[PDB]
Design goal:
The structure is a homotetramer. By secondary structure, chain A is an alpha/beta fold. Chain A has a single domain, classed as Rossmann fold. A 7-stranded parallel beta sheet of chain A has the order 3-2-1-4-5-6-7, with helices on both faces. The termini of chain A are far apart. Chains in contact: A-B, A-C, A-D, B-C, B-D, C-D. At the A-D interface, helix 4 and helix 5 of A face helix 4 and helix 5 of D.
Chain lengths: 234, 228, 240, 234
């Protein structure tokens, strides 16, 4: 199966979890893969992925390093066909205990960083390209002590609705991929909420990312695809 | 690729449009396919066009007794169902003030009642790791002039996916709604209507193991139509 | 006196939310017409409501009885300012056990009956009138053994999105009011209400009066720029 | 006649438009009203226009220290808050490709960060049986060209209502989002999209705010009430 044959894929935050599972899958599907990470752990990830995957150290939030990331991609690949944006950002604090630090860190990574990651990619984004933004079931549900994270992910999903109108006739699709909790006591409690009776696997999220990245989803844009075992559907 | 290798697929309403495109794609992906259609001539033409050993049964998907005959045939010839694609559709346009009992009855009998019993009667055959795909519509979550009966039927349709996944706890049966927008323009963010093969490709995603943690969901294939 | 000199027609108002709405609407100055299927129950409801409220025997699963309802309203009031379509209900069966009767009887009341209740009201609905449809949190959530009822309430909500386009320039607003769990065999009932309350962010089920108060908002001029909407009165239950 | 009799209401951003209309309605309904504005002259003019013993405090929500001063004055003068209508906010229009850090920061600092801290800092004063109303927007759940920053901020805003009601379990505080659509060349363009065929009046939004503030909405929490003439409903 070579469902991403001759496609250039850039994946931010692909050093672990969903990003890493996606990098592995995209390489397996024939993509020329560029991944980013902040820290070494990137070199290990690149070895684990293999298949000619290249790593670029970049702080996805930091603006000047994004310029350097896209300069490298332009020089080495000349275009982007798949952009998969995974942002870290997130911790738990209830209202009454929320700090400026938590707000700033979460939104800088999950919202601001994402906006500029995509904006700076625009000149490289080819006709028939696909931008996949990692959301969360948190963005449309209620969870105790999770309001800052949840709000950041609500903001994230909104981007897909709106940017598809700014990029009219450019042939760039933009979609949100929204996982429930995955494997990567608490897990037993979370699994009880899920209709399917278990938490997701990073690889299952990666398979859904593949759908959105691939030409199979050619008439899917502005959407939010939940990969949640039913958790946010009931 | 062979994403539905050794799978048994049943597709209701597969003699034209999206249903037909899905049957073609499912066969291409290695599925053993059973299809239904109301009319013999279009069904024979469809079976010929699909190829790949596809089998056709002339059945009205909304008629409960004919559903019994479909599933008797599937049981005898295949023994199980791994993929059920319920592609019931149809409706017409009447504004409030002009809605007839006929329009209501025909639309709901086919789009809601027929679907419920199609799935209910399939249950004994649905294997562990099976996937049920229900054809919804962008109409089910939007407003359109003179479309209220159809829109309401498709809203009911989508609800089924949220609820049946709870009735079938631990059975390993996923249920998802596939909701196309306009298919083969100015309102669509992508600036065009969708192609049948594009809806079929999304159907394949939901039918396949790639969607193994997707259930109760509504996947829009609408060029952004119902997303803005 | 927020419904002073308004004619309100409420279907299914002999108990629970409908009754609570009838009482509130009368308190707010409305001339209230209610429907119910059982004459003795209907009469007792009218006695409870008071304030000149009038009862008419009718089932929405019956289009002929709707015709008679509106003949009566036309003759006695000549118009409708507020139409609260609350008549409906359902039962529990899981997939595998759903009967034709459960499907038909639920949809005949909750969907078909609602459409014709509103359609047959159209000639009487004044400029500036408000139609309130009783939905449910069930219409947008998943609940075991509830698929027929849930689908009926999803259909119901869709009507508000669509009819507001059909009724372009008619000055008729259409909104869905969607209650969560409300306190509307006795040992089992108490145990289930406790489990329902545990789900609710507010930690209790709603009172019928609270749903009636939200119905009043939608019926009143305060909601003059609210149409096509679904107002949840659920203590947060379908919001999380 | 008096649906907010002897209630303390604090409205941020109430010197024009919806906020001002809400201040007038709340006063007419018997509330003791405190309003907030950024410009002292405008604030004083608003107070004179409102009457009914309404009191004004100069405050910017992009400034956490000025929120502290606001609640210091409310505590000193009223000792509690029963209704908190967080209406302060704004935005501007830029398409993806042209979004600036300033547009992002300035929008989120008021519409998201400022809202979070406005509510958090009110918590000690919020009485049992109190109501918090957050001004959202139809933009928060729709797509609009050149509007992605504002839209995302209002998606985040609505998320707060889903989540904070869990943080504040048993506190007797309701939190709801009030989401206006078009409200009074460009107006006629907006009006033709509205099912009701016109933009909303500020007084109509204020009436819906009153519902959420009042005891009539006692079993409404975590919700989003659209006051949009059908705009985002179709």
């Amino acid at each position: 199966t070579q469902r991403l044959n001759a496609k250039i894929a850039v994946i931010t935050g692909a050093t672990s979890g969903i990003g890493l599972a996606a990098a592995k899958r995209f390489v397996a599907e024939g993509a020329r893969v560029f991944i980013t990470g902040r820290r070494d752990v990137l070199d290990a990830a690149i070895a684990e992925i293999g298949g000619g995957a290249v790593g670029i150290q970049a702080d996805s939030a930091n603006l000047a390093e994004l310029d350097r990331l896209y300069e490298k991609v332009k020089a080495e690949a000349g275009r982007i066909d798949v952009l998969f944006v995974n942002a870290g950002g997130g911790s738990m604090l209830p209202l009454g205990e929320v700090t400026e630090e938590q707000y700033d860190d979460t939104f800088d990574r999950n919202v601001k960083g994402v906006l500029f990651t995509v904006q700076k990619a625009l000149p490289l984004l080819a006709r028939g390209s696909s931008v996949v933004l990692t959301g969360s079931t948190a963005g449309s549900t209620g969870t105790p002590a999770f309001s800052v994270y949840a709000a950041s992910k609500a903001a994230l999903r909104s981007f897909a609705r709106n940017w598809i109108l700014d990029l009219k006739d450019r042939g760039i699709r933009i979609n949100t991929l929204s996982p429930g909790p995955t494997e990567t006591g608490l897990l037993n409690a979370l699994a009880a909420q899920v209709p399917m009776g278990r938490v997701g696997r990073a690889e299952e999220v990666a398979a859904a990312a593949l759908f959105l990245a691939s030409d199979d989803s050619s008439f899917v844009t502005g959407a939010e695809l939940f990969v949640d075992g039913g958790s946010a559907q009931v």
